Amino acid sequence: SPRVCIRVCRNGVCYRRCWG
């Protein structure tokens, strides 16, 4: 049950990657 969620908010740019 993989519940990973990352977020990269830089220079008005949010790179969220909710893997699972």
Largest sheet: 2 strands, antiparallel
Anisotropy-based shape:
rod-shaped
Beta-strand residue percentage: over 45%
Q: Count the strands?
A: 4
Helix amount = under 10%
Radius of gyration from CA coordinates: 10 Å
Number of helical runs? 0
Distance between the termini: 7 Å
Strand/helix succession: EEEE
Walk across the major sheet and give the strand order.
1-4
Class from helix and strand fractions:
mainly beta
What layout of secondary structure does this protein have?
Elements: E1 4-6, E2 9-10, E3 13-14, E4 17-19
Antiparallel strand pairs: 1-4, 2-3
PDB class: antimicrobial protein
Keywords: antimicrobial protein, monomer
Assembly: monomeric
Summarize the structure in words.
The protein has 20 residues and is mainly β. 0% of the residues lie in helices and 50% in strands. A hairpin with a 2-residue loop joins strand 2 (9-10) and strand 3.
Put the structure in a nutshell:
The chain has 20 residues and is mainly β. It contains no helices and four strands.
What descriptors fit this protein?
monomer; 20 residues; mainly beta; two-stranded antiparallel sheet; 4 strands; 0% helix; 50% strand; rod-shaped
